[PDB]
Amino acid sequence: RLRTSRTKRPPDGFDEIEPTLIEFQDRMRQIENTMGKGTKTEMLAPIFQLHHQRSRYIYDLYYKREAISTELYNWLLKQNYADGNLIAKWKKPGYEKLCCLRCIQTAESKFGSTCICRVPKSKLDKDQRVRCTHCGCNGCASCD
RNA sequence: GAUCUUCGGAUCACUUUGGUCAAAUUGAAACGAUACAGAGAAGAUUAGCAUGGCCCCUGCACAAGGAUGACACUGCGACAUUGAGAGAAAAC
Ligand SMILES: [K+]
Ligand SMILES: [Mg+2]
Ligand SMILES: [Mg+2]
Ligand SMILES: [Zn+2]
Ligand SMILES: [Zn+2]
Ligand SMILES: [Zn+2]
Numbered sequence: 001r002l003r004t005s006r007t008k009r010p011p012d013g014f015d016e017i018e019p020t021l022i023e024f025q026d027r028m029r030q031i032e033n034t035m036g037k038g039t040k041t042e043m044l045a046p047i048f049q050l051h052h053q054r055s056r057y058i059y060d061l062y063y064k065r066e067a068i069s070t071e072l073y074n075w076l077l078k079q080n081y082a083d084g085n086l087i088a089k090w091k092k093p094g095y096e097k098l099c100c101l102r103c104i105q106t107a108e109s110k111f112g113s114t115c116i117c118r119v120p121k122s123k124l125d126k127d128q129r130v131r132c133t134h135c136g137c138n139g140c141a142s143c144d
Numbered sequence: 145g146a147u148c149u150u151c152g153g154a155u156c157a158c159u160u161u162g163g164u165c166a167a168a169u170u171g172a173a174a175c176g177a178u179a180c181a182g183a184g185a186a187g188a189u190u191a192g193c194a195u196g197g198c199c200c201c202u203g204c205a206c207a208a209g210g211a212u213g214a215c216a217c218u219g220c221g222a223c224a225u226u227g228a229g230a231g232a233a234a235a236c
Contacts, residue, residue, distance in 0.1 A: 094157030115160045133161045
C-alpha cells in the first residue's frame with residue numbers, strides 16, 4: 001500500500017490522478033481523528049461512505065471515461081486503492097449503486113436478510129425511509 | 145437505473161437496527177479513617193493436621209496458603225412414681 005521514494009514507479013497514468021487520491025487519504029485521516037456525535041456503530045458510517053466514493057472514483061475512471069490504462073487499473077486494484085469485490089458487484093445488474101459490501105450479505109443479519117437499503121423504495125412505506133445503520137445508506141436499489 | 149424487447153413488456157436486486165439498556169448526583173463492588181478490645185490446646189512460651197457449612201479470600205489448580213484462615217465444639221427429662229407418715233378433707 002504505502003509507497004517509498006525508491007519503490008517501483010507506478011504506471012504512466014498515475015501522476016495526474018495522484019493529488020485527488022491524496023485528498024481522499026487526507027480526509028480519511030480527519031475522519032479517524034474526528035470523534036463524537038453518534039452511537040457505537042454510527043460513528044463508523046462515514047468510513048464506508050468515503051471508501052465507496054473512492055472506489056467509485058476509480059470505477060468512473062475506467063468504465064465511464066476510459067481515462068486510465070488497463071495496466072494502471074490492475075495496479076490500483078492490487079495496491080488496494082480500490083475494493084475489487086465492490087467493483088465486481090457494481091459490474092453486475094441489480095448492484096449498480098451498491099453502498100458497501102456488508103449490506104448485501106445475509107450472514108451478518110439477525111434473520112438472514114439483506115439490509116433495508118437494498119430494497120426498492122416503491123414497495124417501502126414512506127415512514128420507514130431511514131438511514132442505514134451499517135453505513136448510513138439511503139437506498140441502494142438500482143431503480144432509485 | 146443496465147439489459148434486451150417492440151413501444152404490450154420482460155428480465156437484475158427485495159425489509160437493517162447485539163440492546164448493564166438515552167449526554168456520569170438517586171439501580172456494575174468494597175471500603176479509608178478515627179474511637180474500643182486487641183493473637184488457638186485446662187501455668188508460660190508456643191509446631192501444626194483435621195471435623196461442619198446460606199463464612200470466605202489468594203491461587204491455573206483435585207498443590208498449598210490466608211492466626212492450626214475465621215466461626216463453631218454441651219448437657220438435656222418417651223421419669224415410672226411408689227415407699228411411707230401428718231394435719232385436712234370426704235372414705236376405709
Ligand atoms: K501456631
Ligand atoms: Mg490451611
Ligand atoms: Mg482451619
Ligand atoms: Zn446501502
Ligand atoms: Zn452498506
Ligand atoms: Zn444497508
